Design a protein around this ligand. Sequence first.
Ligand SMILES: O=C(O)CC1CCCCCCCCCCCCCCC1
Length: 133
Amino acid sequence: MVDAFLGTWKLVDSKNFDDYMKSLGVGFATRQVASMTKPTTIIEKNGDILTLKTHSTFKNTEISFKLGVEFDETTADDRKVKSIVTLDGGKLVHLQKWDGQETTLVRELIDGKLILTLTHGTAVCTRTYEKEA
Ligand SMILES: O=C(O)CC1CCCCCCCCCCCCCCC1
C-alpha cells in the first residue's frame, strides 16, 4: 500500500533538522549548508522494489530496497548502516542501525503532504514535502 507515497516531492518546511544532524555528529559546516538546502525526494516502485532518490545542491543519495528486507546503506553523512523499510500504520518506516545506535525516518501523508519525522537520541525533526506534478 505504498502507492500514495510515489512521486516527486520538494522540501517546503523543516523543524529541528540541525538538532537531528548534531545528534548524529554531523560537523557544523555541513549542518550550515544542509540548513539551507531544499532536497527533492523521488520515490518509485518496480514490482516490489522501491527506489528512493534524494537530490540536492549539496548531497545526493539513492537507495533501492524490498519492503521488509534488510539492506546495507551508506547515508548522506557517511554512516554505514543496516536498514529496513516497512509499512506500519500506513506510514513508511525506515529504521537504520549501526554501532548499536538506531535512527528512524518515518514518512506519512497528512492532507496530501508528506511529513518526514527523523528521530535519533532525543532529537526529533519534522520535514514537510509537497508533491511536484
Ligand atoms: O530526506 C531528508 O529531508 C533528510 C535527509 C537528507 C538530507 C539531504 C540534504 C542535506 C545533506 C545533509 C548531510 C548531513 C546530514 C544527513 C542526515 C541524513 C539524511 C537526512
